[PDB]
PDB file of C-alpha atoms in Angstrom:
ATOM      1  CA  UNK R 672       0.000   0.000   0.000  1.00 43.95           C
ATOM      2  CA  UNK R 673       2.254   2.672   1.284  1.00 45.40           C
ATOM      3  CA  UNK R 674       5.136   0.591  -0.636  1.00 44.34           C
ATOM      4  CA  UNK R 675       3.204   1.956  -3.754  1.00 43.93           C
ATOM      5  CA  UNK R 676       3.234   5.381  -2.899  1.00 44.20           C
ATOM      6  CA  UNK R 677       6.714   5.480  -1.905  1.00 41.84           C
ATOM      7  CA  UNK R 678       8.022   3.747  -5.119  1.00 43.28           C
ATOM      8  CA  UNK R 679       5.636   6.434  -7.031  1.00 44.17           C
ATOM      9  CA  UNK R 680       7.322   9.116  -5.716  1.00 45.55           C
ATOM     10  CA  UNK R 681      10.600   7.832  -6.383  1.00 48.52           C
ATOM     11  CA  UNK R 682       9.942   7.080  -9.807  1.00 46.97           C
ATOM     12  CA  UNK R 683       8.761  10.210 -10.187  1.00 47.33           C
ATOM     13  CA  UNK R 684      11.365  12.047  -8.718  1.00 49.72           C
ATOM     14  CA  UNK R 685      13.757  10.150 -11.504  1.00 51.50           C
ATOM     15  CA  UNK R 686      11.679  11.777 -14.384  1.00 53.30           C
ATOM     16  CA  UNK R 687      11.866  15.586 -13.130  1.00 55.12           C
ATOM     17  CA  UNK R 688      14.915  15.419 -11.804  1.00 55.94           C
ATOM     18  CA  UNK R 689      16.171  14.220 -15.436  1.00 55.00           C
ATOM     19  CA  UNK R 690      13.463  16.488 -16.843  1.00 55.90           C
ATOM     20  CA  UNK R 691      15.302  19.822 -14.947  1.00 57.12           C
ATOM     21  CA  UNK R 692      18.938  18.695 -15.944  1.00 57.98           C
ATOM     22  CA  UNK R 693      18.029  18.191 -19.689  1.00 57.67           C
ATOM     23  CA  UNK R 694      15.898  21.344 -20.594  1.00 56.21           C
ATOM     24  CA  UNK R 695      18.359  23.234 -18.521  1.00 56.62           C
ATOM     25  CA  UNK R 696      20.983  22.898 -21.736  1.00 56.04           C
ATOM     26  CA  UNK R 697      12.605  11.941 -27.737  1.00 57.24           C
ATOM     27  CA  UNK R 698      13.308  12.281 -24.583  1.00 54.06           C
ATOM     28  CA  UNK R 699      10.037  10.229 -23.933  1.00 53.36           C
ATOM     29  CA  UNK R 700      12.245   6.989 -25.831  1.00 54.68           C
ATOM     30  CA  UNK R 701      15.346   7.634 -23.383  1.00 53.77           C
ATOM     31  CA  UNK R 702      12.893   7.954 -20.623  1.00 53.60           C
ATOM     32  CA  UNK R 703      11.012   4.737 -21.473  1.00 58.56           C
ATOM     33  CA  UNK R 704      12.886   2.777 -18.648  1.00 59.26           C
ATOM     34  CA  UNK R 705      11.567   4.633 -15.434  1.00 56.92           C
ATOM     35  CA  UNK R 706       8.020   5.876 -17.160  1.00 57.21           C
ATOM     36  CA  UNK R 707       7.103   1.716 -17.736  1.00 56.91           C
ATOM     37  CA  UNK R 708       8.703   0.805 -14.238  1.00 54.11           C
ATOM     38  CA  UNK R 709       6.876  -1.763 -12.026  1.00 55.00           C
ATOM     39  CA  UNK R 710       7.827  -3.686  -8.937  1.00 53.29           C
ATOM     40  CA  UNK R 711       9.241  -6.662 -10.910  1.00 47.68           C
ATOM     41  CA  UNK R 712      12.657  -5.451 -12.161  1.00 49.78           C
ATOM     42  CA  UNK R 713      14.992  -2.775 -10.578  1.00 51.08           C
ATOM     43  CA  UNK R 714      14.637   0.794 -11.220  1.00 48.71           C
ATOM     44  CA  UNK R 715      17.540   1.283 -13.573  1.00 44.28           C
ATOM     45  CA  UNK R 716      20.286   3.857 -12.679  1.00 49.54           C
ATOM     46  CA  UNK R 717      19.718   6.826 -14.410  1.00 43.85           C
ATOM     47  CA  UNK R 718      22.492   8.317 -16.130  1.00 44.00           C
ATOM     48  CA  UNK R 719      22.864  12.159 -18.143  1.00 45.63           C
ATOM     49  CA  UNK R 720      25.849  13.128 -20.378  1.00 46.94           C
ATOM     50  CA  UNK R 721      26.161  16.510 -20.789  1.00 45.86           C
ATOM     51  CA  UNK R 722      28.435  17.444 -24.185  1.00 48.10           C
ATOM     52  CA  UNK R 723      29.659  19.982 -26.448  1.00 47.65           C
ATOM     53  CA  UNK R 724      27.846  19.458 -30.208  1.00 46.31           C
ATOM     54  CA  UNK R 725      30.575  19.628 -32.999  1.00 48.86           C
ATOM     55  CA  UNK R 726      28.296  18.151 -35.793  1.00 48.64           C
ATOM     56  CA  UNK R 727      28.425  21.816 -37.449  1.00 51.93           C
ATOM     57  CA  UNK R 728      31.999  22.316 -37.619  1.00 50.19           C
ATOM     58  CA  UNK R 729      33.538  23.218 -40.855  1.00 49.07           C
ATOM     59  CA  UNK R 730      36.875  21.423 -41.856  1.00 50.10           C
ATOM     60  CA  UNK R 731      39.097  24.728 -40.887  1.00 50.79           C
ATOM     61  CA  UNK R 732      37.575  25.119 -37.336  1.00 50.31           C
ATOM     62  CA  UNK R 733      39.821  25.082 -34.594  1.00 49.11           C
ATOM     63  CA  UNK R 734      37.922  24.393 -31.034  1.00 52.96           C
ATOM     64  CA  UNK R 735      40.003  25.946 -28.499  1.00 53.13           C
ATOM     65  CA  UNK R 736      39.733  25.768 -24.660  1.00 53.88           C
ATOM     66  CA  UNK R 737      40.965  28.539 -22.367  1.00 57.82           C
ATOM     67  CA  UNK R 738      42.231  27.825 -18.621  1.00 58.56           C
ATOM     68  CA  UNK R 739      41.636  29.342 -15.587  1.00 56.92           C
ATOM     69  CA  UNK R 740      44.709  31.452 -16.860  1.00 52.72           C
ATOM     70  CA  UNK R 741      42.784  32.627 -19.678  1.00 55.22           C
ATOM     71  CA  UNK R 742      45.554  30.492 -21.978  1.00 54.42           C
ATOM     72  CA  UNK R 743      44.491  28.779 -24.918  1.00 54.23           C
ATOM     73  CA  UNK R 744      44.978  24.733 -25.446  1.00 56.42           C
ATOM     74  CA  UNK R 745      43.827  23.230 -29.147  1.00 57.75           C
ATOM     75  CA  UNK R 746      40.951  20.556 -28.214  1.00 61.07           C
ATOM     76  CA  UNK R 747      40.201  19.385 -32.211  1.00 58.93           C
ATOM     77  CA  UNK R 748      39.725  20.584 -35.565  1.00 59.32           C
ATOM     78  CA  UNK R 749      36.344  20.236 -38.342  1.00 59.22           C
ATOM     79  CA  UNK R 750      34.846  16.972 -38.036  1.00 62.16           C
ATOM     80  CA  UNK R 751      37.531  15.149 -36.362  1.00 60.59           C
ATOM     81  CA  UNK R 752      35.483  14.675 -33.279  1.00 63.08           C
ATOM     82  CA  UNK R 753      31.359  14.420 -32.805  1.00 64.90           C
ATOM     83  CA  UNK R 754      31.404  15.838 -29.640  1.00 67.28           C
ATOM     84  CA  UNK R 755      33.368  16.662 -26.078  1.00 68.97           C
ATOM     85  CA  UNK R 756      31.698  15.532 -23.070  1.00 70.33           C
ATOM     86  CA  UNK R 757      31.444  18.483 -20.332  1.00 69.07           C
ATOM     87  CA  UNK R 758      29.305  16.589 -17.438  1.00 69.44           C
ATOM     88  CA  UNK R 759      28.176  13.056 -16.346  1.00 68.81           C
ATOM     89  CA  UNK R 760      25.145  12.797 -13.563  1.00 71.00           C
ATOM     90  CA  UNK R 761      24.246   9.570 -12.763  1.00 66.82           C
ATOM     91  CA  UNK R 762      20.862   9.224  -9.966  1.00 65.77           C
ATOM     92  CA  UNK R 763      20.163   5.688  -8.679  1.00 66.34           C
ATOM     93  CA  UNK R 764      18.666   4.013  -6.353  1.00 62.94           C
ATOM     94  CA  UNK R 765      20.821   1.738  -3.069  1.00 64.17           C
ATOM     95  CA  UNK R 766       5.112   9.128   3.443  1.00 59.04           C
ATOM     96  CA  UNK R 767       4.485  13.216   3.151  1.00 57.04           C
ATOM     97  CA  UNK R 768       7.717  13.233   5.067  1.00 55.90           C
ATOM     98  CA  UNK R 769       9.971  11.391   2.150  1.00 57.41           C
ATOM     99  CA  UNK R 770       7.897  13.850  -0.046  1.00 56.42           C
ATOM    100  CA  UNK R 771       9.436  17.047   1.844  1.00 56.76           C
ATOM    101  CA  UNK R 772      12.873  15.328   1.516  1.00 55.95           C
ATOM    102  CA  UNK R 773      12.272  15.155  -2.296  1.00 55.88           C
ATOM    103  CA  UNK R 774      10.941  18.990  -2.528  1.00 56.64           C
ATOM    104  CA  UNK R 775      14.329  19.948  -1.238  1.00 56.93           C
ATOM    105  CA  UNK R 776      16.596  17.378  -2.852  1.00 52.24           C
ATOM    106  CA  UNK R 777      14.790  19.188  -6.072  1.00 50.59           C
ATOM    107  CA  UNK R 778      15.467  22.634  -5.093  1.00 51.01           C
ATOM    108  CA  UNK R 779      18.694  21.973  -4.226  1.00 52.07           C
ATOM    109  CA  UNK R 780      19.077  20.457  -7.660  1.00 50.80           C
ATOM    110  CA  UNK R 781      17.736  23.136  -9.535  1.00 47.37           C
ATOM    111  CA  UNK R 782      20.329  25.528  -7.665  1.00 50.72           C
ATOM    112  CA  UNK R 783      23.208  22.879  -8.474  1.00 51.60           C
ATOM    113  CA  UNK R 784      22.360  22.662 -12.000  1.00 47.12           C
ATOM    114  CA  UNK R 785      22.840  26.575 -12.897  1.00 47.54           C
ATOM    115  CA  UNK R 786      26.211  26.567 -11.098  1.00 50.23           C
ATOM    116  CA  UNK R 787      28.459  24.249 -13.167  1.00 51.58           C
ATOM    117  CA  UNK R 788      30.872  25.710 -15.155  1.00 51.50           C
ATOM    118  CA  UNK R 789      28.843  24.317 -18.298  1.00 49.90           C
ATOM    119  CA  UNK R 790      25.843  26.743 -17.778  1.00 51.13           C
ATOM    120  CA  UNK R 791      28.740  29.044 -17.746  1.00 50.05           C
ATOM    121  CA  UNK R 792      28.700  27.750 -21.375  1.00 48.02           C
ATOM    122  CA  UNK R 793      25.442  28.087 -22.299  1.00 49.37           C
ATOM    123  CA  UNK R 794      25.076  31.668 -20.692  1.00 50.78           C
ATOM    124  CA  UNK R 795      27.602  32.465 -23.317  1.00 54.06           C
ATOM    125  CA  UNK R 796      26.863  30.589 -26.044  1.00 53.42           C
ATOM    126  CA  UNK R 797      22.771  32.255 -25.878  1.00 57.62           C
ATOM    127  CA  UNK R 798      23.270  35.787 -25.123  1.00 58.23           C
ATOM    128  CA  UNK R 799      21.386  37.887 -27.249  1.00 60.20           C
ATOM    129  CA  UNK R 800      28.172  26.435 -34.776  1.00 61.86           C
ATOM    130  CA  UNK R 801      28.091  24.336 -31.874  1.00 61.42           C
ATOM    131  CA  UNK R 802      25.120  23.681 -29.460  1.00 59.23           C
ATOM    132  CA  UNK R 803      25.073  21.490 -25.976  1.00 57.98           C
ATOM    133  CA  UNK R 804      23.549  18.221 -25.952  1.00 60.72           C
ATOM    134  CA  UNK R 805      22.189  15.662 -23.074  1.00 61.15           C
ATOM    135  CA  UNK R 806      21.699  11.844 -24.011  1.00 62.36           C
ATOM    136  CA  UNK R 807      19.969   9.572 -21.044  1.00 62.23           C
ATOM    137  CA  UNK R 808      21.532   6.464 -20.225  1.00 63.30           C
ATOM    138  CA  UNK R 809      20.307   3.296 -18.386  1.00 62.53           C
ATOM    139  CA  UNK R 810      23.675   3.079 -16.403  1.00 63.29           C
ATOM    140  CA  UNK R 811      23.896  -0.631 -15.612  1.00 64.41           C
ATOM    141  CA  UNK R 812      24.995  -1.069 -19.244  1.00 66.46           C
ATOM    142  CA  UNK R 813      27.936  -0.653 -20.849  1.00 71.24           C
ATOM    143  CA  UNK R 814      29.118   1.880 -23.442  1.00 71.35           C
ATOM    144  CA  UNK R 815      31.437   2.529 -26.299  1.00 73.13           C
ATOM    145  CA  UNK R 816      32.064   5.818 -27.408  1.00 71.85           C
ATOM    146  CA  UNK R 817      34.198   5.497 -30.826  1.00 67.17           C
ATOM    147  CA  UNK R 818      35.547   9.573 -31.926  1.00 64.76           C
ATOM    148  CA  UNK R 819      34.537  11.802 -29.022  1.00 69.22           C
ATOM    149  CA  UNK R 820      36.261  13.994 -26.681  1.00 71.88           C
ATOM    150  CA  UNK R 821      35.846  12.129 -23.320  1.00 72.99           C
ATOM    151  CA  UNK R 822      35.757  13.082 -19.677  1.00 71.03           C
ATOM    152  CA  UNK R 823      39.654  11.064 -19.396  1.00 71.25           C
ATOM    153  CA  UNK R 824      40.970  14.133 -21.841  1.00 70.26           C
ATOM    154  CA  UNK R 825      42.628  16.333 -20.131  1.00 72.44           C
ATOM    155  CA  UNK R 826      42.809  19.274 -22.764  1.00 70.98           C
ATOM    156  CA  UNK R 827      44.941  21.215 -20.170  1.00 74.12           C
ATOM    157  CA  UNK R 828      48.062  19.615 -19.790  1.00 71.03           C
ATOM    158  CA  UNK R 829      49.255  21.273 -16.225  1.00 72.11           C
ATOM    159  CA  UNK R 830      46.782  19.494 -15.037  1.00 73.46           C
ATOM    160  CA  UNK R 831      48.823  17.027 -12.502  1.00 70.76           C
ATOM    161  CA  UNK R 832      46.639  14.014 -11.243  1.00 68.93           C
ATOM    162  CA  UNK R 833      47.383  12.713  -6.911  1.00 71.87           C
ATOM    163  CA  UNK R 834      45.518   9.885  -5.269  1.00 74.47           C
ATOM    164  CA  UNK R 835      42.743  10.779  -4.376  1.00 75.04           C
ATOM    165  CA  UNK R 836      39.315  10.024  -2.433  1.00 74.13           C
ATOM    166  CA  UNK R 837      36.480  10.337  -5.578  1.00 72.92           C
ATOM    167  CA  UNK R 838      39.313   8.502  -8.025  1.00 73.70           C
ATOM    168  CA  UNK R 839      38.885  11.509 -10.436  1.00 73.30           C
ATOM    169  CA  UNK R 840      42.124  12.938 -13.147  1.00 74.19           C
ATOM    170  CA  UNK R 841      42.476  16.443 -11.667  1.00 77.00           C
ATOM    171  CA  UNK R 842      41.031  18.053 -14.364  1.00 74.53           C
ATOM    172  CA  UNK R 843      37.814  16.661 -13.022  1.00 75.75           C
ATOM    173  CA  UNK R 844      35.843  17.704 -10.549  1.00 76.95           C
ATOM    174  CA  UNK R 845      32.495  15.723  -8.244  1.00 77.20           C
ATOM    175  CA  UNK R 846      29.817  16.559  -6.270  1.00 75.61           C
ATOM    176  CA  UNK R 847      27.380  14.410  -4.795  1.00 73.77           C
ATOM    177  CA  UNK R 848      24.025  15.340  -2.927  1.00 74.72           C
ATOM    178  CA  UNK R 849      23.310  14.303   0.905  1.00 73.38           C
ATOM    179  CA  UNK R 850      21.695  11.069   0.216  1.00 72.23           C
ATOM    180  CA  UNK R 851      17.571  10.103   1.097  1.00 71.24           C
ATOM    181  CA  UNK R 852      17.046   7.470   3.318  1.00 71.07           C
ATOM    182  CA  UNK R 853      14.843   5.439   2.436  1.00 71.66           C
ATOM    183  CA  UNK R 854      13.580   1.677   3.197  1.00 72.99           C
ATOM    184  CA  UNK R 855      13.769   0.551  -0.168  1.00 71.44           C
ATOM    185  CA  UNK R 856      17.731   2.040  -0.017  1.00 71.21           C
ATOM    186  CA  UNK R 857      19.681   5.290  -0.309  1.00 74.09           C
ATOM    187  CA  UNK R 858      18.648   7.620  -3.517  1.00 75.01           C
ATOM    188  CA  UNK R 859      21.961   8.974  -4.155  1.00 75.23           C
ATOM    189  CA  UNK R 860      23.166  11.640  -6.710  1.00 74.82           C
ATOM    190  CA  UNK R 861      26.361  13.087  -7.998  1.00 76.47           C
ATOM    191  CA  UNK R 862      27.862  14.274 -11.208  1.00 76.93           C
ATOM    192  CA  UNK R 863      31.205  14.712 -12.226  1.00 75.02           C
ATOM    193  CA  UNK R 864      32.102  17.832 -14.512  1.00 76.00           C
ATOM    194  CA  UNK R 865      35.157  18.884 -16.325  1.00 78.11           C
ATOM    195  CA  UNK R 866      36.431  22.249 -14.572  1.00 77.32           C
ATOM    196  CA  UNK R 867      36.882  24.168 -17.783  1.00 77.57           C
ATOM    197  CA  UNK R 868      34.668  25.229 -20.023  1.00 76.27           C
ATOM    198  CA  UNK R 869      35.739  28.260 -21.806  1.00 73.95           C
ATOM    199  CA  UNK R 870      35.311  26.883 -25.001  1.00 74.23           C
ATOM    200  CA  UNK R 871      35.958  28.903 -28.412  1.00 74.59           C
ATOM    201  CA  UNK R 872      35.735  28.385 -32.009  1.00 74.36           C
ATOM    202  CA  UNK R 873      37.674  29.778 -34.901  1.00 76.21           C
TER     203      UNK R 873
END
């Protein structure tokens, strides 16, 4: 009974929260694996890529990338590359009051989601070529990814990677929310985000 309502609003909470992170930068297909979720499988971790479109590119085109020094580091030329991947979110799973927990765990997301340095991005890239993307992911499969620019590249090569906690390169960066308790487990979420994105094109 109550086991109903809880899973609803967990389901539920999977679908705006990947609603808010997407429009922020069809998706009824992608979503097709938590909108026809029932009891008798596993609700599938959830995961967002968040990428720099390069299908538009002409042949001369140089995509640069700035540092925090404001110096400039070639990243690809034309058609060389589909895409570079800027973010990767990934939400899975291990009452009114689990409902309150999920109104904040929302806000909280909405605030999260216009501070990466990608929004940064596409401030720029719509004040008043190349366009951001998002692609959903059922995360407990496998993927290839044959001529991109991934998360692993480093474009920035002072970039020195130590040991460290999360396991990230260090020009990487993570942040992962408090998590809900909840009987059926933990909903936990984090994303991990490439530091720069002062992207340019010439």
């Amino acid at each position: 009974s109550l086991d109903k309502q809880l899973w609803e609003l967990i389901d539920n909470f999977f679908l705006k929260a990947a609603l808010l992170i997407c429009h922020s930068k069809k998706l009824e297909r992608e979503l097709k694996p938590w909108t026809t979720f029932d009891g008798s499988e596993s609700l599938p971790p959830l995961v967002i890529e968040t990428y720099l479109d390069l299908a538009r590119l002409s042949p001369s085109q140089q995509v640069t990338l700035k540092d925090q020094d404001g110096n400039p580091w070639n990243v690809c030329k034309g058609t060389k590359k589909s895409e570079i991947m800027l973010e990767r979110w990934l939400i899975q799973m291990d009452v009114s009051e689990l409902y309150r927990q999920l109104v904040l765990l929302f806000r909280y997301l909405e605030t999260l989601v216009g501070l990466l340095p990608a929004s940064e991005l596409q401030a720029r890239l719509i004040r008043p070529p190349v366009k951001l993307g998002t692609r959903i992911l059922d995360g407990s499969k496998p993927i290839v990814s044959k001529g991109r620019i991934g998360l692993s590249k480093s474009l920035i090569a002072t970039y020195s990677n130590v040991i460290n906690e999360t396991n990230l390169p260090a020009h990487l960066e993570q942040r992962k929310i408090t998590p809900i308790r909840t009987k059926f487990g933990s909903l936990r979420i984090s994303v991990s985000y490439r530091k720069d994105c002062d992207f340019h094109v010439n």
